[PDB]
Design a protein around this ligand. Sequence first.
Ligand code: CLA
Ligand code: CLA
Ligand code: CLA
Ligand SMILES: CCCCCCCCCCCCCCCCCC(=O)OC[C@H](CO[C@@H]1O[C@H](CO)[C@H](O)[C@H](O)[C@H]1O)OC(=O)CCCCCCCCCCCCCCCCC
Ligand SMILES: CC1=C[C@H](O)CC(C)(C)[C@H]1/C=C/C(C)=C/C=C/C(C)=C/C=C/C=C(C)/C=C/C=C(C)/C=C/C1=C(C)C[C@H](O)CC1(C)C
Ligand SMILES: CC1=C(/C=C/C(C)=C/C=C/C(C)=C/C=C/C=C(C)/C=C/C=C(C)/C=C/C2=C(C)CCCC2(C)C)C(C)(C)CCC1
Lengths: 37, 222, 60, 50, 50, 34, 48, 231, 67
Amino acid sequence: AKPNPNKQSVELNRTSLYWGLLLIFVLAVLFSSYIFN
Amino acid sequence: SVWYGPDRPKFLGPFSDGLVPAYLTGEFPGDYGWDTSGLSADPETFKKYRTIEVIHARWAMLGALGCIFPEVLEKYSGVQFGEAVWFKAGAQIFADGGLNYLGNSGLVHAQSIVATLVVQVLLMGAVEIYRANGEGPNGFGEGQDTLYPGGAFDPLGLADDPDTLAELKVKEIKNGRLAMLSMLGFFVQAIVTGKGPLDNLLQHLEEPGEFNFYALYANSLA
Amino acid sequence: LVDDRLAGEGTGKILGINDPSLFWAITIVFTIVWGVFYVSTREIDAASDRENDDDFGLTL
Amino acid sequence: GLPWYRVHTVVLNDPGRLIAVHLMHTSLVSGWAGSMAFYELAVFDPSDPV
Amino acid sequence: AGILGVLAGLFHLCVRPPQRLYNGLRMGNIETVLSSSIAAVFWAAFVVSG
Amino acid sequence: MLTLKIFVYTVVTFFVSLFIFGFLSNDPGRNPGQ
Amino acid sequence: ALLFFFGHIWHGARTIFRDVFAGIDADLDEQVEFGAFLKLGDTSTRRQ
Amino acid sequence: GAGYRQYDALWLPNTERPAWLDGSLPGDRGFDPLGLSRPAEYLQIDLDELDQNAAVNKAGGVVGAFTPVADQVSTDSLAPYSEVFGLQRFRECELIHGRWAMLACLGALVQEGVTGDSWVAAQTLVYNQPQYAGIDLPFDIYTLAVLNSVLMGXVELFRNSELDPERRCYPGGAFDPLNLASDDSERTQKLREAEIKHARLAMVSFLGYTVQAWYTGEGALGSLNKFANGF
Amino acid sequence: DTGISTPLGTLLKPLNSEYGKVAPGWGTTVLMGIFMALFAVFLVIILEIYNSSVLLDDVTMSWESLA
Ligand code: CLA
Ligand code: CLA
Ligand code: CLA
Ligand SMILES: CCCCCCCCCCCCCCCCCC(=O)OC[C@H](CO[C@@H]1O[C@H](CO)[C@H](O)[C@H](O)[C@H]1O)OC(=O)CCCCCCCCCCCCCCCCC
Ligand SMILES: CC1=C[C@H](O)CC(C)(C)[C@H]1/C=C/C(C)=C/C=C/C(C)=C/C=C/C=C(C)/C=C/C=C(C)/C=C/C1=C(C)C[C@H](O)CC1(C)C
Ligand SMILES: CC1=C(/C=C/C(C)=C/C=C/C(C)=C/C=C/C=C(C)/C=C/C=C(C)/C=C/C2=C(C)CCCC2(C)C)C(C)(C)CCC1
């Protein structure tokens, strides 16, 4: 009916982007070394 | 409308203008102007004859459907009655297994002819006394028409409009007259051919120009 | 034989009916649909605000 | 705006969309069950159960 | 357990919660339901693992 | 196999009867014409 | 099971402490004064 | 005026009738130690604030005291009565329970006498092979199960359609063909008292039946025989 | 802006009508505590049965009980 009153917009700044990229790549390093066996 | 008044259809087509009596004015369903013998000149006898005709029509419709149903259900189905022909289905009460409904040994399993006759006498006498008196138990059905009651006999309410009621009356009387003629046909065919009504139809459809009354039984009837 | 089958191919049956059960299915379904359609024809015709006399229908 | 770890809180006070997201989760779980069963059937060898 | 569950479901359908318990457990919130359900499921996970 | 034939016959006749009795139900009057 | 124990703890803390999810009140010094009230956090028992 | 004592009688020789039981109902003996029919009082709690756009979201407070009115039937089909804890609804439940218990007691006794099987084993025997008085029925157990569910559902949906709380217990009409207690007089009140007493007695008797079978493993006639052949 | 009407929603409406209705006071907390205590005792009993901290005559508590 009427527009949903629970509308929100997500956000992510450059610091969060850098932290996420670093976490992804470090986890990839460690567990790729362990998964290739 | 189409079926009432002076412009209604008549039973001789264009030749029926000079044969319609003065008392068949087109007031009741099924009025086609056929009173050549003048047996309904008296209004009281006319009313009694109308009641008799409608009751006969209803009974004949039920009888035709019930005479043709178990024979159809025995050939084009998996049901196995003790006897499917209508004029031979009364002797099942003397069989070893009794009368089994739909061929099932645990549906009715009637064994005594006298008990069924007594129960039928009681029930039919009660209902026909109620109908003739026009007054059921505890004053049930008082003030209703003795031929078209309605109310408890019309649960679906298909006759709540007078025009629809008149049209349905015409339909009922025409179907009933056709059923009466068909039941007379059933009786005479059973007497002459000796086989079921469906057997005659299927044998005729096998070869219509060869299996009919004239080619088989006409010359042996004198 | 080794197994069982309907064995009806290339026979020439009327409407493919090798069974009264099939005949009854066809007839019952057709009659039900026709009966449902029959009672609504008076109402459907009245939606055009015209009587179903000899001049009824889409004409040109 | 909302942080990335608070996105699903929009349906906290929305019963209809709460039902919707629960239905989506159930659909995903059933799909996983069916797909896993098919994958295991494609690679199973029932020749020797001993 | 099924019989007891039916009986307890009828009880909880018929009887309203106490005011003190309502205020203490925040029965007007749905996150309390979430927390209790999470507790129950991790209890069940420990049991099935053992 | 006969049960499957009966079921398919029922379905087919149902849909074909729907088609016929829908096209018989005053179809050339459902147009936006004046 | 272990991860869901953490989840239970987090969500219970969030549902009980819901009014202070964005932060504590601006002036919260009288209630957190040692020996100001007989009962902890109760402003109707100011003594001792 | 001799051979007895002249002597309202309650459930105790010296006790007082509760305020909510005024003695107008048929079987009213002033018996309610737990006060289940006492008019309940409730409270209304305001809606919790769950807005994500607000700084402070406090819980809900008490709006005010709230005592509802019960024994009112509406067109809900899923909660017709105004409240669960009402005297009229409890009376209807008691009457339905009692009628079912009377039928159950009489039927268990008659079936045990006629067939010779215990009323507990009769269920399994009929499940394995449907029968009645030694006559095998022409129906399958699956068809019987579906038919029983459908017929009972239809009957109870018909019964639920009533809206008058008085006629929900005593419909009359087609259910009183002989017109025995269909008016407002002293004769109907005595019949209602007898009905409620029989209902209570049959309820207690069937609770008996069930516990006795649980403990001794016998039915009703079986329990009688086991008790008789134990002296 | 009442909402969207629906036959099923109207059928199920009375089941979602009493939001904040509560029983005044402590209500039935003591009965629920009694049930909780009984549940705790039952859980302790079954845990000790599995743990072999309690030994029963007819309970084998082994793979051999499948015989
Ligand atoms: C590890 C510590 C721990 C902590 C700090 C919490 C903390 C909390 N719990 Mg959780 N919880 C835990 C473990 C824990 N829980 C466990 C193991 C379970 C069982 C699944 C639960 C199940 C649970 C429920 C069902 C609920 C909470 C809720 C809550 C909140 C407050 C209510 C509370 O105090 O419950 C009391 C918690 C206790 C652990 C204390 C009881 C102490 C026990 C009974 C010891 C008795 C000793 C024992 C019988 C001795 C013999 C045993 C021997 C034979 C082995 C809060 C977030 C409540 C809530 O508000 O959620 C929003 C609520 O609804 N919890
Ligand atoms: C109401 C409609 C009616 C219908 C549709 C049928 C149908 C059938 N009849 Mg029956 N019949 C009826 C009434 C009816 N009959 C009546 C009232 C009687 C008593 C006189 C008979 C006596 C009867 C006999 C003695 C025989 C049949 C047989 C037959 C078959 C046709 C072959 C034949 O020689 O017919 C000839 C029909 C009659 C002697 C009289 C019919 C008079 C009615 C009023 C005519 C209905 C008109 C018709 C549908 C269309 C016009 C065709 C025709 C008049 C030119 C056919 C299955 C035959 C059969 O079983 O062979 C396998 C056969 O042996 N019928
Ligand atoms: C039972 C199911 C369950 C449910 C319905 C919720 C529901 C919620 N959680 Mg809780 N939570 C749970 C269990 C659950 N939680 C558990 C087990 C933990 C411990 C790990 C937590 C810890 C937790 C935290 C720390 C937070 C929440 C918050 C929230 C809210 C927002 C979540 C969010 O938007 O994520 C959006 C998520 C992402 C964009 C991506 C996450 C992807 C993860 C890292 C891995 C990928 C997952 C994989 C595909 C599927 C998992 C498999 C399955 C077996 C788990 C929401 C009310 C948030 C909050 O409270 O809001 C105010 C928040 O901060 N939860
Ligand atoms: C004739 C009245 C028409 C009224 C209006 C009809 C409207 C139709 C709407 C569209 C329907 C299309 C789908 C139909 C599906 C059901 C049929 C089907 O699959 O049957 C498939 C079945 C197959 O039957 C098979 O039979 C075998 C033994 O022979 C075995 O028994 C098999 O098990 C069985 O399946 O065939 C039939 O039923 C035969 C149908 C014969 C129809 C004759 C029509 C005569 C009158 C029309 C003449 C012109 C027809 C067109 C010619 C030119 C075409 C370019
Ligand atoms: C109109 C007119 C006019 C002018 O003026 C004059 C004149 C001419 C005289 C007139 C005419 C008339 C006529 C035609 C008549 C007819 C009639 C009929 C036919 C009837 C039948 C009628 C008929 C009928 C009822 C019938 C019925 C039947 C029945 C019930 C049946 C039953 C049954 C069944 C189910 C089955 C089983 O298994 C068997 C039985 C048991 C058997
Ligand atoms: C539309 C439709 C349809 C279809 C459907 C379908 C086809 C579906 C599918 C579905 C599916 C097919 C689904 C799936 C899903 C899946 C999932 C959901 C998964 C998940 C996973 C995960 C989550 C994982 C995780 C992990 C990893 C990665 C590693 C290790 C660790 C873990 C385990 C954590 C049909 C026609 C039928 C009907 C109608 C409608």
